[model samples]
Target: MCIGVPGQIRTIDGNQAKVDVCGIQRDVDLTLVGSCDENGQPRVGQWVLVHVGFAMSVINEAEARDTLDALQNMFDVEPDVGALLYGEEK
Candidate 1:
């Protein structure tokens, strides 16, 4: 199963934003976050919860750490989490 992962926004370009998760960077849809500024720009250095290549919501840095801790627990519980995330058959 794919769980929500916390990521930090590194850069925002129009509707696409680059988010960093555990040192890995990926592109995400900013529209899904629904917390953009009046100019439709997601602030850099913000935390967001992403799922399936989309930002589910904008979160504070504290929230990011808390959720990351929780998500890492899943990694501990089952190493297959990585496979699941990558859609690998196991």
Candidate 2:
């Protein structure tokens, strides 16, 4: 099982990008996904689906929000999702 978080791109330089996730920004490379364009590819405000250490796709606003909701749901307090010690959501 693997997980990828959705983040919005803030700036782009060459094949590298700084993504903002919940207000925190981190740098990631996009060359693995595609090349840059003359129009300064990926422009700001675009959504990037990041996994592992790269941007896998350039998504839209709607999908970005949906992805966030899905990620929250997966980590939600569930009654029987894992072995209990002190992880039972209070």
Candidate 3:
């Protein structure tokens, strides 16, 4: 199974796109889910599923918000990083 983070597209530059996830910005490859509208080009302000450094798929606004909520829930249950990495809970 693979997991992708949900982000909103901020800008499109050629085959690259700028995505915003939780206030962090990143550049993601837009070769996969290119056409997000009738113009065969991905538009700004579109929500997409970003995997690694690429946009894997496009999603609707409702799904985007729902996925973010789920992600937040999962994060709320996240374990201590120190416990997993250094064998000590911090």
Total clashing pairs in model 3: 0
Better of 1 and 3 by TM-score: 3
Q: lDDT (0-100) at residue 45 of candidate 1?
A: 91
Q: Model 3, residue 53: what's the lDDT?
A: 84
Best by TM-score: 3
Q: Any idea what lDDT model 2 has?
A: 0.70
Tens-digit lDDT string for candidate 1 (8-37): 998877688888875667788887655476
1-90 per-residue lDDT for model 3 (tens digits): 243789888887777878886466678887787735767655689899988888888887889999888876744566642344345321
TM-score of each: 0.70, 0.67, 0.72
Number of the top-ranking candidate, with lDDT as the measure? 1
Error of 1 at 3 (Å): 6.6
In model 3, the runs with Cα more than 4 Å from the true position are 1-3, 40-42, 77-90
Worst 10 residues of 1 by lDDT: 81-90
lDDT, candidate 2, 1-90, per-residue tens: 242788888777767888786456677778766535457555578888877758888888899999888876764567543433234331
